[PDB]
């Protein structure tokens, strides 16, 4: 296997508009949502068929109970942070927890909270501490670091339970998460203002890809414009790399994807 | 399924060491609790273990081995007041707190010098902690179990049983 | 309080060919807060049957959505994406770069 | 810290029983367990916060209500013989690693009650014995130096028990209301002693 990740997000709004929930929580394996929960439905539901098919109803029931509790905690903590900041109106509170299982088998884990879209508290599971960004976060850090058993629980979950869940979900979605769809790559020429070469790749999975241009085969050219890796909508992804050419060189597009190197030389 | 196995009953002498094992088989692990509960009294928290290692809190030690899925509560310098049940609780991957049946610890008093004899009711008392009593034989006859009295001002401990309405290993002395 | 301007990118699922069915995508990403309004336009007119994924979360605390609809491109028609956000004074139109 | 209703309760089958659990520690999570012989604690109902209640592992025949934060009431709609157990409640702050604080516990046995009969049997030192017989059920509480009461008292289906000690003996019986259309004598909550 390659590097995979599992992570859960929580989001809370203080004065939500009628169409916006007060609390949302979504889980992801690498880039696919697998779980979802909001204050409107008050139920944890699958976001992938291989999650609903391979999980008994008891799982969803118990984690729905847990998510109701977590939503309540989020509401209280957001109100407390607004009280500390002397803030009124609508504000956002976010949490992300997760882990990564790499190619060489090593594991990483992370947990953090944000207030109004900015890092608020970053958990360090090696030193068993919380990094605080301001004084309010320092108050919350003093509050949380007093509960040693909770820090130990967080360490054990990030290092042991999260990786177990990741492997279990990977086996659940083996035909989706661990498949390989090779890209289709083409070369276009466009007239600007001069002529430019576009290397367009599309229809591939996983999203991670590398594209570049090279002149005379041995040197990487400069002033390369890169297109973002965007979801095409059918589960595959697309991207591109363009350069501008006036001198007579031999240019070639190089695309590396999922351990396969591809070279398109253009005349 | 998921269950928690710990011994039903344990017996150790006063001033000695005892090790109450607790092995668990669950899908996932989120911590193991140890609770002390005297008979008819509220359970009392003792320790929480979630990482491998040994934690020492006073006379009590709590070890955990996630690999072996096993824990033990260590009681050093056993005292008569340590006689109680000890509960093992494990939390699974679905955050469900599984509770073990408990381990009833019994402390045998250290008798320096006994003078056993049988003294309406019949009172068997002042015998050594190594001699147990056997229950009543006839349905009409009644007999109690061992009891430990501690006269704190006199620094004295003794065992005693009451039969009122025998067949037991009473010392020949 | 921190606010992030969204990044609007319009593209087709497959390489565009006039007369062949396709899907028009509008990928709005990197905005904060979460509430946003996105619409796809056909010749400057709102399209009713538009679909979007659920609100997704990025590691940098921002959000992203994928609005799409089924369409058949032509040599004359032009499509675009209309997005309004707290960080935008007036709604922004990003025309589909046919290229 | 955490307190409950009376530690002993005698109720007839088919009655609506109200068990209480009050804590002054401003705790969110509150629990209701039942402790049966040979089994560990089993969660009946669990409340995360006010006006919040989630069913536990054995919610059949049980109901709860969390109106005040401090009070967690356990409601027995139709009392059954199977519902004879030691009822323990607990409270704790939110968190999977936080310990729970239990109340004193309530022994509920679910007609045949008879008060204890107490006596004192006089004697290299003083050895006095107190003895109570014939009480039913085991709802009996009886200077804390040099004492040893039997932890388990003493072959019929409803056989009344007998305990011994080494003499105040308080018994827990039927309340004043809803009682005794049946016979001539009444065992109620009383303290029977024996002088010596």
Residue numbers in the entry:
A (entry chain A): 0 to 192, 195 to 246, 249 to 270
B (entry chain AAAC): 1 to 119, 130 to 175, 187 to 194
C (entry chain AAAD): 0 to 98
D (entry chain AAAB): 3 to 112, 117 to 129, 138 to 156, 165 to 176, 181 to 192, 209 to 238
Study text:
pmcThe major histocompatibility complex (MHC)–related protein 1 (MR1) is an evolutionarily conserved MHC class I–like molecule that presents small metabolite antigens (Ags) to αβ and γδ T cells, including mucosal-associated invariant T (MAIT) cells. Mucosal-associated invariant T (MAIT) cells express a TRAV1-2+ T-cell receptor (TCR) that recognizes microbial vitamin B2 derivatives presented by the major histocompatibility complex class I–related molecule (MR1). MAIT cell antimicrobial immunity is largely mediated by recognition of conserved microbial riboflavin metabolites that are captured and presented by MR1 at the surface of infected cells, flagging a molecular signature of infection. Here, a biosynthetic intermediate of microbial riboflavin (vitamin B2) synthesis known as 5-amino-6-(1-D-ribitylamino)uracil (5-A-RU), produced by a diverse range of bacteria and yeast, reacts nonenzymatically with ubiquitous small chemical scaffolds, resulting in the production of unstable ribityl-pyrimidines such as 5-(2-oxopropylideneamino)-6-D-ribitylaminouracil (5-OP-RU) as well as the ribityl-lumazines such as 7-hydoxy-6-methyl-8-D-ribityllumazine (RL-6-Me-7-OH), both of which are captured within the A′ pocket of MR1 (9). This MR1–Ag complex is in turn detected by the evolutionarily conserved MAIT T-cell receptor (TCR).
To gain insight into the molecular basis for binding of TRBV28+ TCRs to MR1–5-OP-RU in the context of pairing with TRAV1-2 or TRAV36 chains, the crystal structure of the MBV28 (TRAV1-2–TRBV28) TCR–MR1–5-OP-RU ternary complex was determined to 3.1 Å resolution, then compared with the published MAV36 (TRAV36–TRBV28) TCR–MR1–5-OP-RU and A-F7 (TRAV1-2–TRBV6.1) TCR–MR1–5-OP-RU structures. Consistent with all published MAIT TCR–MR1–5-OP-RU complexes, the 5-OP-RU ligand in the MBV28 TCR–MR1–5-OP-RU complex was sequestered within the A′ pocket and formed a Schiff-base covalent bond with MR1-Lys43. The MBV28 TCR docked ∼82° to the main axis of the MR1–Ag binding cleft, with the TCR α- and β-chains positioned atop the α2- and α1-helices of MR1, respectively. The buried surface area (BSA) at the interface between MBV28 TCR and MR1–5-OP-RU was ∼1030 Å2, which aligns well with values for other TRAV1-2+ MAIT–MR1–5-OP-RU ternary complexes (1050–1200 Å2). Although the α- and β-chains of A-F7 and MAV36 TCR contribute almost equally to the BSA at the TCR–MR1–Ag interface; the α- and β-chains of the MBV28 TCR contributed ∼60% and ∼40%, respectively, which is attributed to the altered docking modality of the MBV28 TCR β-chain to MR1. Specifically, the center of gravity of the MBV28 TCR β-chain was displaced by ∼2.2 Å toward the F′ pocket compared with the corresponding β-chain of the TRAV1-2–TRBV6-1+ A-F7 TCR.
